[PDB]
Amino acid sequence: TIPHLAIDPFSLDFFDDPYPDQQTLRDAGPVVYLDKWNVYGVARYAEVHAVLNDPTTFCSSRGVGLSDFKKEKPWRPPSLILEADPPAHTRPRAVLSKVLSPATMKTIRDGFAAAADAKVDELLQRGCIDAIADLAEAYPLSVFPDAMGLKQEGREHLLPYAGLVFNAFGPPNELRQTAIERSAPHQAYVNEQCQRPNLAPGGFGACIHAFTDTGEITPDEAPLLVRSLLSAGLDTTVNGIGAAVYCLARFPGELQRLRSDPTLARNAFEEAVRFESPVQTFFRTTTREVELGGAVIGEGEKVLMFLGSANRDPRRWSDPDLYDITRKTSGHVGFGSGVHMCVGQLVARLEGEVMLSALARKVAAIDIDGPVKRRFNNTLRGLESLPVKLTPA
Ligand code: HEM
Numbered sequence: 001t002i003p004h005l006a007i008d009p010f011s012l013d014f015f016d017d018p019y020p021d022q023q024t025l026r027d028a029g030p031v032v033y034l035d036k037w038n039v040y041g042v043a044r045y046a047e048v049h050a051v052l053n054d055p056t057t058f059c060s061s062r063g064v065g066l067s068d069f070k071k072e073k074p075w076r077p078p079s080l081i082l083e084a085d086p087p088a089h090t091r092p093r094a095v096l097s098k099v100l101s102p103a104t105m106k107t108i109r110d111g112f113a114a115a116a117d118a119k120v121d122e123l124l125q126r127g128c129i130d131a132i133a134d135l136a137e138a139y140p141l142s143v144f145p146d147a148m149g150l151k152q153e154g155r156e157h158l159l160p161y162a163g164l165v166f167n168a169f170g171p172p173n174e175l176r177q178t179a180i181e182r183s184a185p186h187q188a189y190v191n192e193q194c195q196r197p198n199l200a201p202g203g204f205g206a207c208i209h210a211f212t213d214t215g216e217i218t219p220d221e222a223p224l225l226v227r228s229l230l231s232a233g234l235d236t237t238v239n240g241i242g243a244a245v246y247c248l249a250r251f252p253g254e255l256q257r258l259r260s261d262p263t264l265a266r267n268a269f270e271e272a273v274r275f276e277s278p279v280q281t282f283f284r285t286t287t288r289e290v291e292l293g294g295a296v297i298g299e300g301e302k303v304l305m306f307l308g309s310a311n312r313d314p315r316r317w318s319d320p321d322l323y324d325i326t327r328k329t330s331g332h333v334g335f336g337s338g339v340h341m342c343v344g345q346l347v348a349r350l351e352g353e354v355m356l357s358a359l360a361r362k363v364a365a366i367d368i369d370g371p372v373k374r375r376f377n378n379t380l381r382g383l384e385s386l387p388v389k390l391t392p393a
Pocket residue numbers: 060064081082083093096100228229232233234236237239240241273277278279282333334335336337339340341342343344345347348
């Protein structure tokens with residue numbers, strides 16, 4: 001009934017070009033079994049959406065990586081939000097929602113936009129740049145650690161720590177075990193910055209700690225919630241912005257549309273998130289026997305969702321493999337869906353928007369002018385190096 005496939009979605013060959021294998025996964029059936037890792041897989045939009053939106057049956061408290069916390073010890077203490085289910089999830093979620101609220105975006109937008117404009121001006125002086133190190137990495141590094149309230153010293157630990165976190169959702173392959181063995185100094189730095197005294201006034205970190213007064217979280221919960229933002233808040237946006245620039249570089253017609261109407265910047269970024277899907281995959285664990293897509297899955301089984309695949313499923317999208325900055329993007333699952341849907345999505349969109357706005361207003365052309373190199377991660381899709389020439393408007 002359920003087809004079995006030998007495809008390894010965490011292999012380097014798969015990362016290098018996942019799209020043919022993703023079609024194979026979609027077309028095999030609504031539910032497949034991945035013999036390589038003994039997990040169920042869903043790669044169509046319909047089933048990915050269904051799983052995300054039934055948190056009771058498809059839980060997160062047994063981990064959203066391959067590892068089942070009921071069987072193995074988590075590599076770090078569980079996240080109070082990502083790796084929790086309702087009701088435990090609900091109050092910590094509400095706190096991060098308020099910390100990263102619509103109202104909060106007003107306090108940081110001017111600074112984020114200024115830094116984006118400044119970066120693009122700086123890059124135009126050089127002309128030929130690496131759109132990863134010099135833009136996709138440099139810009140979020142120039143605004144997010146400050147918005148968190150982090151000191152300057154030690155920030156070089158942030159991207160390695162995030163790479164570790166997202167590799168750790170994967171199976172115990174080489175990527176994962178190498179990350180974990182190098183992890184000690186990054187964990188030590190991050191855990192220390194989570195303490196209240198080390199987070200500057202007015203920043204996201206201080207604001208989380210300030211909520212420990214209200215009855216929503218206790219003081220001992222605040223450091224792990226800061227840890228969530230230091231885990232999920234930087235490397236994701238690096239790959240999202242990298243994705244957007246890569247799309248504009250490959251699809252010059254869309255850059256030209258963006259230049260002609262810079263107010264398309266926000267949707268151009270959203271479409272980039274759909275099109276590349278910086279977060280490719282993660283898991284749920286079944287809490288009961290369940291019927292999904294006409295198949296029966298037993299209790300305590302890992303289910304691997306292919307978010308990137310769902311975002312290219314022709315059953316849901318017209319011309320899924322085209323980058324279209326005026327596409328109706330609502331419903332894409334690049335930020336997830338349901339109760340765990342990215343709590344930081346307003347920050348992500350703000351960064352993406354103001355950077356694409358800067359490019360739209362200041363840059364006439366983006367031409368790849370060197371070898372493109374991919375960055376491999378069990379969960380994240382993105383580039384290591386993207387040599388481009390920027391032509392000023
Ligand atoms: C382009 C950038 C981003 C992408 C693609 C992205 C993607 C996602 C996805 C797919 C989830 C769902 C996980 C699940 O359902 O198990 C998620 C959750 C989460 N994200 Fe984002 N994210 C991004 C940026 C951010 C930022 C900027 C922050 C914080 C400042 C952040 C913090 C979080 C947190 C704390 C969760 C857990 C929410 C929950 O479990 O309720 N992320 N993200």
